[PDB]
Design an enzyme around this catalytic site. Structure first.
Site, mmCIF file in Angstrom:
data_model
loop_
_atom_site.group_PDB
_atom_site.id
_atom_site.type_symbol
_atom_site.label_atom_id
_atom_site.label_comp_id
_atom_site.label_asym_id
_atom_site.label_seq_id
_atom_site.Cartn_x
_atom_site.Cartn_y
_atom_site.Cartn_z
ATOM 1 C CG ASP A 1 -5.238 -2.708 8.201
ATOM 2 O OD1 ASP A 1 -4.561 -3.178 9.138
ATOM 3 O OD2 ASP A 1 -6.358 -2.179 8.361
ATOM 4 C CB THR B 1 0.804 -1.464 2.989
ATOM 5 O OG1 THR B 1 0.227 -1.932 4.215
ATOM 6 C CG2 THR B 1 2.303 -1.336 3.174
#
Lengths: 521, 354, 39, 534, 60, 180
Positions: free
Chosen positions: D55, D89
C-alpha cells in the site's frame, strides 16, 4: 537537480530476483550433509564469540549473522519452524532452497509470478489432501512403538548409539511432568521439566529423577541432612522486620524506646518464627533473606532452612512436594505443608553440594541428572533431549505416523504427478515442478554416502507405482533400497506436515520480490 | 554484562560492544504477544532507589535487574562474570549485602565492581590523578593512584548545582523579576547552561559588566528576557568557588582538595600533580579550569607545577571505564568468586587481614 | 529527474544567465565605465 | 544591482519542471504497488530492517524527502490513507500525471488562471457526474458485497489467493462489533478489534475468536486457568502496597503503635481483597501491580488476577462483557463497597497456548458478541502485511456500510468518466474546454498502470472500453454498455459484478478532491527563493 | 520562500514576503517596516507600496 | 449534552493544602483512618456543593503547583452524570464568560446557581480521525466574540487563507473606520 536524499538506491528486475535465488542457494549449500541417520557433523563459531557444534537446521542458522537480508528472512523462517514443531529444520531449509532453484527454471521463460503462485496454492492443497489420504494412525499405548519412534528420530542424531537408553531417559521424564488441572487441559511443560547438567560422569549416567534436584545447600551445620518424609513448607517472605512502604523517622525523645525498639523487633521475629514452629515442620525454603534470630529459633526446634531459590525452581518444587507457596508465616495454615518426597538428600555431586528431593508420589516437575565430559557435550545432549521431548509430545498429541527417510515423500510426489495430468492447463508445469523439486529429499541421503543415485531413484520411483508400494525408503547406513515396514523409521506427522506448509509458503512469499530500496530511515 | 547503574541510568551491552544496546528510562514486540510488555512496563514503573551516592532500597534493584537482562539482553549470568557500577561511596555493609542477593538469586561465578571515579579515570585514559567528582546533590574528592581508591582519602562536600541555581534565585529577587516556579527554575537552569562562564574573578567581572557594560548579552528568548547585565551569568560560578556567597561560610573546595592531597606522601602527589583531571555534574562552562588552576596555584608552591585536564564529553565515561577493565586481562586476578563466597561468605570482603 | 546525471562536463562549474534581467547586468557596468569618463 | 536576497532564485519553468521532476521521481517508484496485479516492493531500513509493503502510504512514509512539493505529496498520500485507506498508491500517480499535463500546457504559453479555474470546475463537474450517472444498488447484495470489497482490498496484498475464508472471517468480525450511533444508523468502533498476531504455521492456521484475547497471561500457575463461570471485576486502582499520601510523615514517641502501623500497610489492601473476594470473584483485572500478598490471597481463593492491564482494551472488554470500570469502591458517598450487580458476563477464561506461548482468552461475552483476530503466519513481516491489509479492508467496509453506495471499478469508473468528460466539455467552448479535455485524457493513467502491471495490450482494451462507453453515452438506446469495466484477471471487458470488484463512491470523490486541490495549489506556484541555510 | 529552517511558506501578502527575507541592507528593512506600518493601518496588498516607493526613487 | 447549565471553576480542587508549607503528622492507625475518611468527606462535600448548585458541565482552568483536578472528582461526576474540561488558559476567561455567561469564582462560597451560563447544545465533533473538539452552541448570554474554523489539505494553504481573511478583516475595519 536532485529530488530525494542522495542515499537512495533502488533496483528492480529479474536480476535481483535471481540474486535472491542465488542467496537461497548460498544458504542451501551450507547445510547439505547433516541429513538422515548417516550424517557428517558440523561446527560453528558463536556470534557472541563462543563455539558450537550442531547438525540441525535452525540451531545452526540461529547462530549465524548475515547481510543481504533475504538470508535473514530464511533465518527467521528457520527459527519459526524450530520453535514451532522442533525437528526437520535442515529438511525445510534444503527443500525451500532447492525448490526455489526448480522454480527459477520456470520463471526465466517470460512467465509471470502470479500463475506460479496459483500453482503453488494448488500444489500445497493437493499435498495436504493426499497426506491426509496417506497418513495412518498408531495406538499410543506402549513402550515399544514410542521408543521405536524415538530411535527413528535420533538415529539422525549423535545419541543414536544410546537411542534405547535415551528413549527411557526421555519416556520417564515425560510421564512425570505430565499434569492436568480442573478436569481438563493436560499439560506437559518443558520448563517444569527443568534441564540440569553436571560435570563428569559417563554418558549412560543420564537419567530423570523421580523428584527434584537442585543446586543449593543447607544454611547451618546443625540442621540435619537426612529426612525420609520431609515436612517442607514454601516460604515467600524475607526473614527480617518488615519495612513495608510507609515513611520513616518516628521521633525519639526518651531513653526507654531504643533498646525497646530492638527488643520489639526481636519479638516480631519471635512470633513470625513461632507461627512456623507450631505446625511441626522439618525443612523450610524461602525466596528471600533469613535472619540469624530466626535460624537460631528453628535450630532450637530442629527445622531445616534454605536461602533464596529461583522462581521456576520454586514452582517445580511446589509441583513436586505438593505444598503451596505462602508469603504469610503469620497467616500459616495446616493446608499446605509439603508431603510426598521420598527422602531428603544432601550430597556433593562433584565438589559443589546439591539437594536431591526424591519423591514418592506422582510428580509434575523434574530435574534431569546429566553426566558427561565437557560443557559442549552436555549442551549437545541437551539439544538432543529437547528434540526427544518435543517429538514425544507431538506423538502424545498425534496418534498418526508417517515413515521418514524418503519414502512417503517420493510417494506423494508420484501421487501428485499422477493428479497433475487429469486437468488441462499450462499451470500443471509449475505445479508438477514442485514434485520434481521434492525429489531432492533422497538425493542428499544418498549423497551423504556416494552411491549410484540414478538407479536407486528410478527404482523407487517405479516401485511407488505398481501395487502402490509406497512404503520403501533407503537404509541410510547401507544406502540401499529397503522397505520401511522392517527397518523401523517413523516420525511424527506434525514435523513433516509443518515442513510441507512452511516450505511451500516461503516459496510463495519469496517470489513476490521484484523491487528493492536501501538508504532510508 | 557491561550493565552500569549510573547516576540515574542503567546501560546494557557487552564488553566488546562500542555501546550498550538498551537504556534505562527508570511497542517493539508489544503488538505480537505482549509477554514482555507487562514486565517492561512494570519495571518502568519502579523508581531509581539511589540518591546522594548511597543505596536506599534493595528489593527494587533486583526486581529491575531480573527483567532488564532476562527479557531484552537475553543472557544467562550463571555462565558469565558480572561487572556493575555502584554508588560513589558506601561502607562494606551495602557491598556484602548486594553480594548475598546476587549469589542467592543468580549464583553467578565471579564479580568485580569499582567506584565511578575509577571508571571515569580509566575512560580518560589515566591510572593516576585526582578527579573532582562534582556530582549532583553532592560533590566528592577521589584521589586515585594506580587504580584503587583510598578509603582514607575520600572527602565529601555538600555543594550542588541545584544549590547554585537556588542561590542565584536568592539574588535574582534583587534583580527585580525573581524566578521560583518550575518553569522559572527551568529557565534559570537554561540560562545557566547558556552562559555562566568565568573570566577571572567576581569584582573585576562585575566592573567590566557594569562600568562599561560590555559583558551584557541580551536574552531574546520566549521564556527569557534581557535582565542580565553580565552579572547573573557570572553570579552562578562565584558561589561555586566562594562559600560565603551562599551564606554557609566555610573553606573553599580548593582547600579540601589541597588537604586531601597533602595528607598523603609528597612523592605520590607528584603523580597526582601529573594529570589532576576533573569531572562534571555541576560544571559545564569554561573559565573553571584556568581559574581553579591559578587559585590553587596560590596554594601550590612555585617550585612545583600543576596541570588541569577536562574533557568536553564525559557522559558514558563510567561505561568506557567498565568496558576497558573488562578487557584489562588482569582483573580476573582480583575476581571474588564462588570459591571464596561459599568458603568464607562476606568475611574476606571485610578484609579480615591487616 | 529520477536519477541525477550530467550532460555538460563540469556542468556545476559553469554558470548560465539569461533573460531581460541579464541585459540589466551589462547595463550595470554601462554606468561605471560611462560614469568613469564623464569627468 | 544584485538582489539583496543573499539566497538562490530560480525562475522560469525550471522549478516548475523540477516539481514535475519531483512529481516524476517518486511516482513511478511507487507505481508498481496497486491493482490486482501490483507486485511487492522491498525496503531495507538503514538499520537492517527489511520490510514488505504494497500500500502506497506505508511505502512512502519511511522515505526521506527534501524537495518541498514532494513532501506535500507525501502528506497527501498519508492523509489519503488516514481518512480513506484505499487507493493507497493511485492518488500520487494521478496527481503526478496531472502536474505533467499542466506544466506542459503552461509551457505552451497559456494563462495559469484559466487552467486553474478549469481544474476547480472540472473537479466539481467530475464529482457531480460520479454522483448522478453511475447510481446502482447495494441492497441487491449484503454479507457478500463485503466479501467482494475485501477481495478488492487484498487484490494487491499477500493473501489475495485465500480470500474465501478470510473475507467471511472479516465480515463476521464487522458484524460482531456493529454498534449504533444516532439510534437510527449503524456505528463502528474502529481500532476496537485487536488483531494480535503470531509467527504461526500458515495463513490458513489463523483463527477468529468470538470473544476476546488479551496480550496478557495468567500471573502464576497457582491460579486455576479455566474458571467455570465468569463474573469479571475490572479495576483501574493500583493494587500495590498501599501508600497513604505523599505529604505525611510519622512522628511516634509511643512505640506500641509502631509495629501495628506495619500491620496497616497490609490490612487495607487485605481488607479490600476480602471485600473483593467476598462477592465470589472469578477474575481480577488491574492496571496496578500485584504483589506476593495479593498473589497468595488469590491463589487461596482461586481467582485470576492480572497486573499491568492496559486501559483502552480494558474499557473494550468491560463494555463487551457488560463489566464496569472501577477505580475505587466508594459509592455515591464515602461508603467504599463492592457491588455484585455489575460483574462482567462471560462463559470462561483460559490461558490457551497458540504456538509455544500462552495468553488470556475470553469466551463469549454475554448478551452480545465481540471481534478479535489471531493472525498466525509463517513469520513476522508477512503477518504484519496481513495486519495492514485487514486494517485497510475494515476501513473500506466501514466506509461502505456507513454510506451504502458502491460502483464497479477496474477502470470502469475511469473509462466512463473520461468518456463523459471528453464528450462533455462543450459547455464553455473556450480556453477552458481544452482544460476539460486534458482532464478526460489524464485519467488514462489508471488503465495504463494496471495494464503495465498486468502486461496487457493497453490500447486495445482502452479503445474497447472507451468505444462502449461512448456509444452508451451519445446513444443511450443501449445504455447497458455503461455497466462494463476492465478486469485484469484475463484482460476482459466485463460487468464488474461477477468478480464483485466494487469501490465506494466517496473514495473516488475524496481522492479526486484532494488531487485537484494539490494540483491547483502547485499551479499557482511560479517562483522560488532558496534562502541561505542557518 | 524556503527558510533555512525546516519550513516553507507559500505567500502573496507583501509584508509577509518582505519579512521572510532576513537581508542585511538597510533600505529593504525600511521598506519592511513601512509595510508593517501599512498593514497596521490598512492591512491589504502591501505589494503595491514597495513598488510605489521604488518608482518614486527612480523618478527622483 | 443539551440545554446544560454550564459551570466554570478556576480555583484549586486538590487535597486540602495550604498556600504555605505544612505536613499532617499521623501518630497511629486511627489517625490514618480519620485522615482517609475526612479527605473523602471534604472532597465529596465540595462535589455535593457544586451538584446542589444545579450545575451540569464543569470547567477547570490550568494551574501548576498543586493543580485543580482529582480522579475522585471524575468518579463522583460520572456517578452524577457531569462533564468536565480541565487545564484552560488564563486570559481566555473573558471570551468564555462573555460567550456563555458563566463567571469565574475562586471560592465555593461565591459560587452561585444564577451564575450558570446556559447553552443549548454542547457537542463533541470528530475530524475523521483528526481529534475531537468541543463546540459551544445556543448560549443564552450575549457574547460579543465569534470564532471560525478553517480546514485544508495541508498547513500552508490554511496559513495563506488565514492571512487573507485577516487582511480582509483589516479591509473592513478601515471601511467602518471612515466611509469612502
Amino acid at each position: 537537480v536532485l529530488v530525494l536524499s542522495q542515499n537512495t538506491k533502488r533496483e528492480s528486475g529479474r536480476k535481483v530476483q535471481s540474486g535472491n535465488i542465488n542467496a537461497a542457494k548460498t544458504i542451501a549449500d551450507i547445510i547439505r550433509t547433516c541429513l538422515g541417520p548417516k550424517s557428517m557433523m558440523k561446527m560453528l563459531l558463536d556470534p557472541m564469540g563462543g563455539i558450537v557444534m550442531t547438525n540441525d537446521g535452525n540451531a545452526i542458522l540461529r547462530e549465524i549473522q548475515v547481510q543481504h537480508p533475504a538470508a535473514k528472512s530464511m533465518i527467521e523462517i528457520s527459527r519459526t519452524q524450530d520453535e514451532e514443531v522442533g525437528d526437520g529444520t535442515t529438511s525445510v531449509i534444503i527443500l525451500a532452497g532447492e525448490m526455489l532453484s526448480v522454480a527459477e527454471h520456470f520463471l526465466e521463460q517470460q512467465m509471470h509470478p502470479t500463475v506460479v503462485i496459483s500453482a503453488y496454492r494448488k500444489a500445497l492443497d493437493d499435498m495436504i489432501s493426499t497426506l491426509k489420504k496417506i497418513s495412518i494412525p498408531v495406538d499410543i499405548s506402549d513402550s515399544d512403538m514410542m521408543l521405536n519412534i524415538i530411535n527413528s528420530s535420533i538415529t539422525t542424531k549423535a545419541i543414536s548409539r544410546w537411542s534405547s537408553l535415551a528413549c527411557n531417559i526421555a519416556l520417564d521424564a515425560v510421564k512425570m511432568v505430565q499434569f492436568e488441572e480442573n478436569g481438563r487441559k493436560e499439560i506437559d511443560i518443558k520448563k517444569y521439566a527443568r534441564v540440569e547438567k553436571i560435570p563428569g560422569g559417563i554418558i549412560e549416567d543420564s537419567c530423570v529423577l523421580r523428584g527434584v534436584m537442585i543446586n543449593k545447600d543447607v544454611t547451618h551445620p546443625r540442621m540435619r541432612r537426612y529426612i525420609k518424609n520431609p515436612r517442607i513448607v514454601l516460604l515467600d517472605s524475607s526473614l527480617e522486620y518488615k519495612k513495608g512502604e510507609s515513611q520513616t523517622d518516628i521521633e525519639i525523645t526518651r531513653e526507654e524506646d531504643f533498646t525497646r525498639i530492638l527488643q520489639m523487633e526481636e519479638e516480631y521475629i519471635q512470633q513470625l518464627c513461632e507461627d512456623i514452629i507450631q505446625l511441626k515442620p522439618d525443612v523450610v525454603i524461602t525466596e528471600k533473606g533469613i535472619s540469624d534470630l530466626a535460624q537460631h529459633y528453628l535450630m532450637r526446634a530442629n527445622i531445616t532452612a534454605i536461602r533464596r531459590v529461583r522462581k521456576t525452581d520454586n514452582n517445580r518444587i511446589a509441583r513436586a512436594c505438593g505444598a503451596r507457596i505462602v508469603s504469610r508465616p503469620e497467616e500459616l495454615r495446616e493446608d499446605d505443608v509439603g508431603t510426598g518426597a521420598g527422602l531428603l538428600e544432601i550430597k556433593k555431586i562433584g565438589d559443589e553440594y546439591f539437594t536431591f528431593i526424591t519423591d514418592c508420589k506422582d510428580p509434575k516437575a523434574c530435574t534431569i541428572l546429566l553426566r558427561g565430559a565437557s560443557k559442549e557435550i552436555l549442551s549437545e545432549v541437551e539439544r538432543n533431549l529437547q528434540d526427544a521431548m518435543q517429538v514425544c509430545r507431538n506423538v502424545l498429541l498425534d496418534p498418526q505416523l508417517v515413515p521418514g527417510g524418503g519414502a512417503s515423500e517420493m510417494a506423494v510426489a508420484h501421487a501428485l504427478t499422477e493428479k497433475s495430468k487429469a486437468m488441462t492447463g499450462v499451470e500443471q508445469w509449475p505445479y508438477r515442478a514442485v514434485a520434481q523439486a521434492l525429489e531432492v529429499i533422497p538425493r542428499t541421503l544418498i549423497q551423504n554416502c556416494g552411491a549410484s543415485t540414478i538407479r536407486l531413484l528410478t527404482s523407487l520411483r517405479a516401485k511407488h507405482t505398481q501395487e502402490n508400494c509406497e512404503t520403501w525408503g533407503v537404509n541410510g547406513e547401507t544406502g540401499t533400497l529397503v522397505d520401511m515396514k522392517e527397518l523401523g523409521i517413523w516420525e511424527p506427522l506434525a514435523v513433516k506436515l509443518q515442513t510441507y506448509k512452511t516450505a511451500v509458503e516461503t516459496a510463495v512469499l519469496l517470489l513476490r520480490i521484484d523491487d528493492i530500496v536501501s538508504g532510508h530511515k | 554484562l557491561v550493565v552500569d547503574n549510573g547516576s540515574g541510568m542503567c546501560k546494557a551491552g557487552f564488553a566488546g560492544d562500542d555501546a550498550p544496546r538498551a537504556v534505562f528510562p527508570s511497542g517493539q514486540k508489544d503488538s505480537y504477544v505482549g509477554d514482555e510488555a507487562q514486565s517492561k512496563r512494570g519495571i518502568l514503573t519502579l523508581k531509581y532507589p539511589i540518591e546522594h551516592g548511597i543505596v536506599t532500597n534493595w528489593d527494587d534493584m533486583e526486581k529491575i535487574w531480573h527483567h532488564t537482562f532476562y527479557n531484552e539482553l537475553r543472557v544467562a549470568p550463571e555462565e558469565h562474570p558480572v561487572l556493575l557500577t555502584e554508588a560513589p561511596l558506601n561502607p562494606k555493609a551495602n557491598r556484602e549485602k548486594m553480594t548475598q542477593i546476587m549469589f542467592e538469586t543468580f549464583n553467578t561465578p565471579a564479580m568485580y565492581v569499582a567506584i565511578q571515579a575509577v571508571l571515569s579515570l580509566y575512560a580518560s585514559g589515566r591510572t593516576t590523578g585526582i578527579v573532582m567528582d562534582s556530582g549532583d546533590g553532592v560533590t566528592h574528592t577521589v584521589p586515585i593512584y594506580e587504580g584503587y581508591a583510598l578509603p582514607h582519602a575520600i572527602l565529601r562536600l555538600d555543594l550542588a548545582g541545584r544549590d547554585l541555581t537556588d542561590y542565584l534565585m536568592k539574588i535574582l529577587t534583587e534583580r527585580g523579576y525573581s524566578f521560583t516556579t518550575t518553569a522559572e527554575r527551568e529557565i534559570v537552569r537554561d540560562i545557566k547552561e547558556k552562559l555562566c562562564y568565568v573570566a577571572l574573578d567576581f569584582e573585576q567581572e562585575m566592573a567590566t559588566a557594569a562600568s562599561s557594560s560590555s559583558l551584557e548579552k541580551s536574552y531574546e528568548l520566549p521564556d527569557g528576557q534581557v535582565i542580565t547585565i553580565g552579572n547573573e551569568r557570572f553570579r552562578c560560578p562565584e558561589a561555586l568557588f566562594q562559600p560565603s556567597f551562599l551564606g554557609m561560610e566555610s573553606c573553599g573546595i580548593h582547600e579540601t582538595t589541597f588537604n586531601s592531597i597533602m595528607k598523603c606522601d609528597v612523592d605520590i602527589r607528584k603523580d597526582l600533580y601529573a594529570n589532576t583531571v576533573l569531572s562534571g555534574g555541576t560544571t559545564m562552562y569554561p573559565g573553571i579550569a584556568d581559574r581553579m588552576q591559578k587559585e590553587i596555584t596560590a596554594l601550590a608552591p612555585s617550585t612545583m607545577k600543576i596541570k588541569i585536564i577536562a574533557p568536553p564529553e564525559r557522559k558514558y565515561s563510567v561505561w568506557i571505564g567498565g568496558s576497558i577493565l573488562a578487557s584489562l586481562s588482569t582483573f580476573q586476578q582480583m575476581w571474588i568468586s564462588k570459591q571464596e563466597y561459599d568458603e568464607s561468605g562476606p568475611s574476606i570482603v571485610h578484609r579480615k587481614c591487616f | 529527474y529520477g536519477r541525477p546525471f550530467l550532460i555538460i562536463k563540469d556542468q556545476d562549474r559553469k554558470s548560465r544567465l539569461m533573460g531581460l534581467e541579464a541585459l540589466k547586468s551589462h547595463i550595470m557596468a554601462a554606468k561605471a565605465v560611462a560614469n568613469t569618463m564623464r569627468t | 544591482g544584485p538582489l539583496s536576497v543573499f539566497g538562490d532564485r530560480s525562475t522560469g519553468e525550471t522549478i516548475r519542471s523540477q516539481n514535475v521532476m519531483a512529481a516524476a521521481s517518486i511516482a513511478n517508484i511507487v507505481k508498481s504497488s496497486l491493482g490486482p496485479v501490483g507486485l511487492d516492493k522491498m525496503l531495507v531500513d538503514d538499520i537492517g530492517d527489511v520490510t514488505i509493503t504494497n500500500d502506497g502510504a506505508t511505502i512512502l512514509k519511511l522515505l526521506e524527502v527534501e524537495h518541498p512539493a514532494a513532501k506535500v505529496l507525501c502528506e497527501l498520500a498519508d492523509l489519503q490513507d488516514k481518512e480513506v485507506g484505499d487507493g493507497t498508491t493511485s492518488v500520487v500517480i494521478i496527481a503526478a500525471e496531472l502536474l505533467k499535463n499542466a506544466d506542459e500546457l503552461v509551457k505552451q504559453k497559456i494563462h495559469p488562471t484559466s487552467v486553474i479555474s478549469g481544474y476547480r470546475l472540472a473537479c466539481k463537474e467530475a464529482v457531480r457526474y460520479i454522483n448522478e450517472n453511475l447510481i446502482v444498488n447495494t441492497d441487491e447484495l449484503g454479507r457478500d458485497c463485503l466479501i467482494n470489497a475485501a477481495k478488492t482490498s487484498m487484490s494487491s496484498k499477500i493473501i489475495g489467493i485465500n480470500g474465501d475464508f478470510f473475507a467471511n472471517m472479516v465480515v463476521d468480525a464487522v458484524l460482531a462489533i456493529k454498534y449504533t450511533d444516532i439510534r437510527g444508523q449503524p456505528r463502528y468502533p474502529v481500532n476496537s478489534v485487536n488483531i494480535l498476531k503470531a509467527h504461526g504455521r500458515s495463513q490458513m492456521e489463523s483463527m477468529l475468536i468470538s470473544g476476546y484475547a488479551l496480550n496478557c497471561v495468567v500471573g502464576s500457575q497457582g491460579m486455576p486457568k479455566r474458571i467455570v463461570n465468569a463474573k469479571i471485576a475490572c479495576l483501574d486502582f493500583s493494587l500495590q502496597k498501599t501508600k497513604m499520601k505523599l505529604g505525611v510523615q510519622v512522628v511516634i514517641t509511643d512505640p506500641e503503635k509502631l509495629d501495628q502501623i506495619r500491620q496497616r500497610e497490609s490490612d487495607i489492601t487485605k481488607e479490600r481483597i476480602q471485600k473483593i473476594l467476598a462477592t465470589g470473584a472469578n477474575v481480577i483485572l488491574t492496571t496496578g501491580g500485584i504483589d506476593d500478598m495479593c498473589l497468595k490471597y488469590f491463589v487461596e481463593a482461586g481467582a485470576m488476577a492480572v497486573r499491568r492491564v492496559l486501559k483502552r482494551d480494558l474499557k473494550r472488554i468491560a463494555k463487551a462483557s457488560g463489566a464496569t470500570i472501577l477505580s475505587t469502591l466508594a459509592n455515591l458517598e464515602g461508603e467504599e463497597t463492592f457491588e455484585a450487580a455489575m460483574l462482567g458476563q462471560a462463559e470462561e477464561v483460559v490461558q490457551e497456548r497458540i504456538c509455544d506461548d500462552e495468553l488470556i482468552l475470553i469466551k463469549n461475552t454475554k448478551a452480545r458478541t465481540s471481534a478479535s483476530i489471531i493472525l498466525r503466519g509463517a513469520n513476522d513481516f508477512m503477518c504484519d502485511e496481513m495486519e495492514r491489509s485487514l486494517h485497510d479492508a475494515l476501513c473500506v467496509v466501514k466506509r461502505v456500510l456507513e454510506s451504502k453506495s458502491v460502483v464497479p471499478g477496474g477502470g470502469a469508473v475511469e473509462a466512463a468518466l473520461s468518456i463523459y468528460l471528453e464528450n462533455y466539455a462543450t459547455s464553455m467552448g473556450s480556453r477552458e474546454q481544452l482544460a476539460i479535455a486534458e482532464f478526460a485524457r489524464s485519467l488514462l493513467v489508471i488503465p495504463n498502470t494496471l495494464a503495465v502491471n498486468a502486461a496487457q495490450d493497453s490500447t486495445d482494451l482502452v479503445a474497447k472500453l472507451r468505444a462502449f462507453h461512448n456509444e452508451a453515452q451519445v446513444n443511450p438506446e443501449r445504455k447497458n454498455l455503461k455497466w462494463i469495466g476492465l478486469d485484469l484477471s484475463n484482460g476482459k471487458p466485463r460487468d464488474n459484478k461477477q468478480a464483485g470488484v466494487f469501490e465506494p463512491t466517496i473514495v473516488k470523490v475524496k481522492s479526486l478532491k484532494f488531487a485537484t486541490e494539490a494540483a491547483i495549489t502547485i499551479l499557482r506556484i511560479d517562483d522560488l527563493i532558496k534562502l541561505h541555510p542557518e | 520562500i524556503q527558510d533555512g529552517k525546516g519550513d516553507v511558506t507559500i505567500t502573496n501578502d507583501g509584508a509577509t514576503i518582505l519579512k521572510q527575507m532576513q537581508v542585511l541592507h538597510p533600505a529593504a528593512r525600511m521598506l519592511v517596516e513601512l509595510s508593517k506600518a501599512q498593514d497596521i493601518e490598512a492591512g491589504d496588498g502591501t505589494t503595491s507600496v514597495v513598488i510605489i516607493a521604488g518608482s518614486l526613487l527612480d523618478s527622483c | 449534552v443539551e440545554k446544560a447549565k454550564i459551570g466554570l471553576i478556576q480555583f484549586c480542587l486538590s487535597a486540602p493544602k495550604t498556600d504555605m508549607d505544612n505536613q499532617i503528622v499521623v501518630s497511629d492507625y486511627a489517625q490514618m483512618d480519620r485522615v482517609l475518611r475526612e479527605e473523602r468527606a471534604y472532597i465529596l462535600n465540595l462535589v455535593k456543593q457544586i451538584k446542589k448548585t444545579g450545575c451540569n458541565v464543569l470547567l477547570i482552568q490550568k494551574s501548576i503547583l498543586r493543580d485543580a483536578l482529582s480522579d475522585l472528582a471524575l468518579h463522583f461526576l460520572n456517578k452524577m452524570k457531569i462533564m468536565v474540561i480541565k487545564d484552560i488558559e488564563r486570559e481566555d476567561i473573558e471570551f468564555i464568560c462573555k460567550t456563555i455567561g458563566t463567571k469565574p469564582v475562586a471560592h465555593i462560597d461565591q459560587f452561585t446557581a444564577d451564575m450558570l451560563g446556559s447553552a443549548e447544545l454542547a457537542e463533541e465533533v470528530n475530524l475523521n480521525g483528526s481529534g475531537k473538539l468541543l463546540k459551544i452552541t445556543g448560549c443564552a448570554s450575549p457574547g460579543k466574540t465569534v470564532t471560525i474554523v478553517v480546514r485544508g489539505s495541508n498547513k500552508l494553504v490554511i496559513e495563506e487563507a488565514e492571512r487573507s481573511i485577516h487582511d480582509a478583516l483589516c479591509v473592513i475595519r478601515c471601511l467602518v473606520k471612515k466611509r469612502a
